[PDB]
Design a protein around this nucleic acid. Sequence first.
DNA 1: TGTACAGTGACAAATTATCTGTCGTCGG
DNA 2: ACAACGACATATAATTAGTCACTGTACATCTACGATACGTAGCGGCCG
DNA 3: TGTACAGTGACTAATTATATGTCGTTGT
DNA 4: CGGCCGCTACGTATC
Lengths: 507, 84, 83
Amino acid sequence: LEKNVIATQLSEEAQVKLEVIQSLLEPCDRTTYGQKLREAAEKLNVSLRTVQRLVKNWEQDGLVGLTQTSRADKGKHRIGEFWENFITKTYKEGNKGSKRMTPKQVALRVEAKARELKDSKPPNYKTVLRVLAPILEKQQKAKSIRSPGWRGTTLSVKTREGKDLSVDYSNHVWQCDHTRVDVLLVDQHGEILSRPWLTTVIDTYSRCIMGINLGFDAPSSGVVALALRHAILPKRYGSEYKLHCEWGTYGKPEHFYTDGGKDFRSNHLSQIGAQLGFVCHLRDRPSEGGVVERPFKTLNDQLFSTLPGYTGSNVQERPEDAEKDARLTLRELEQLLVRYIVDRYNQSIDARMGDQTRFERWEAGLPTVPVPIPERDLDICLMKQSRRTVQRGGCLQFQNLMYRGEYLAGYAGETVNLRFDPRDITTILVYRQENNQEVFLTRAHAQGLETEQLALDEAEAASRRLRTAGKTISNQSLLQEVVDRDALKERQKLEQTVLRSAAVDES
Amino acid sequence: LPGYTGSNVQERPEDAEKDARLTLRELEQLLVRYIVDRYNQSIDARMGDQTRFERWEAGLPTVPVPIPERDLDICLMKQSRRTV
Amino acid sequence: QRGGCLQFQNLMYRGEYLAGYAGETVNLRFDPRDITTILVYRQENNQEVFLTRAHAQGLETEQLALDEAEAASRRLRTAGKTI
DNA sequence: TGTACAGTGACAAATTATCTGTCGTCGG
DNA sequence: ACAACGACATATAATTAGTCACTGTACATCTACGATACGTAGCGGCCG
DNA sequence: TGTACAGTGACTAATTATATGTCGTTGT
DNA sequence: CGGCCGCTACGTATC
Ligand SMILES: [Mg+2]
């Protein structure tokens, strides 16, 4: 290869040598050039042989030949190899696994071996630091390494399969994951609840935020189903959100890309994906999915750090007043966060581009305007019970609840596919297999509960209590084990009440 | 020691639960060797002249009289009254 | 250091009006023949500015010279090195 | 090619207290 | 006779190991645990 | 006046690759 | 007396 070297910051001594060399650039004659050397021996206080060496160092190296080169020992240690290997490997072994041995502690191991070997000059602690110095800088550098980024309109998302998804247009690849927000919220009475969970759905091509879910609720394939319908459907917000632009963003993904959480690697999201026709894809590392993750730092920096009750990004940065200074309810935080996403965030510049907004790039990036799906057809969100069988008397029994259906007595002994809503299990949609296809059969209803609404976590909590209470299984008996615990509080029920009040304001 | 958790969660070695090995009896063997042979034998700061133990022992107003172990019955809890 | 204190030759010095400068850097001047009192100067763009006097604390009344304080310090280091 | 917002070096422009001429005034 | 290069000797700051006074930051109850999913096994009721 | 250990500027001693003379040798 | 089929319970994995 090519091998060049250039001098810099030359002057401090070297300008005197440079002026000597400038006076000597030409062998004018054998008589005169010797006189020029013997004259230069007045500017440098040195013999003819020192000036002849200077001229040879200049002619063979150029300007660096004026500068004094560093000694051959620079960076080598005089303590001998035994001690240099003992010190290096002792450090490394002592920082193996969970151990975090300090150089001082390494020096103690040096004095201990020197005592065993009857040495008299075990390296001093100051020299231990020096010997370990280079392998500490490396560690600090290896943490600090920057990565460039996608540049221009071309983007290839890596999966856990080693396949890359080429992101060609708007709604080609959506992405999703969850996080805690960093604000403690209060109930409608001003008492502490908990820090909400935020879900975001993003389109990869435009980086526009295509939908959210905010709530005290837990990450679940239900919260993902709700984030999906909010992303897919056309969006409506009332004047109490004070929006000055529209979240005009909707339609159905071709692919959905996620971390490996049990919300996403689930049969429920598989069934949603098969019915909507989108393919579920797995993120290979957290560092591949920055389009999901980075909305979250921006929101900490642009929104949540400026709100009362802020908790910091971690426990070492927690404002000590966070538990006393909380003020917002979930309905206030959503009314702030939705505004932020519609008026600010989707209207800001797409950073890869510099000359489009995130929304402008999404809208112009559709291959065609997609048709709005009917709100009833989002019943593909309903969970599937795969292999329950019809009992004689036209009956289905399910999470203790017993169901009756309009044609269902025709199919006693047969196997049926049941589609249901975890928010309301009073009613079941019954499908059956015919010609190796599902066909709709009937809207079965929990007998004697046709006037009544049970969510699955209520029927489940009532069943747990009923099992442990030792009472019999029936549709009312389960309702009886709800209505007391309803009427008679526990943080999850208090959270659920505030979350419900937000869902009411959605209607 | 194996199983070190760092000072707080931000330092927690990812292997802390993979690398735990000591029983409570073994940690106490180590901790008492350390306190007797090392910590109480180190030089007292705020002085520099004296070993920490030597400063305790020379510091005494008098040699204390040992208390018979049975006379640490005083450590028993009192139930302030019961009525016969 | 807090309350207007400085460390010099292992002695601790307390400044007369210095307490407002805690956590600041100051420079300082003294006569080697007698380091019981030290003169503290604030640092500025082309100048040192005289700030206040500071006096040694916890020492014997007899006036302390600089060479004598170095000696006290090497006696402590020698004693520590016996352990 | 992970990612995108806030903080930070590097450079340019308008304003003002400060350094320089030139002249006038006063003292030795 | 003049200039350039090497042998040999001699003095020299760069580098490293060591010592010392001043200072920064942890000790100050605290992440194993909660919340989802799947995958497999079990309990009695109903039928042969 | 919290409290005491590990890391850090500031200075010094031992070692060495390196710059300087001085002379011998060779080319011109 | 023996076998088959809904609703609970334990074990494992991941954010
Ligand atoms: Mg995740």
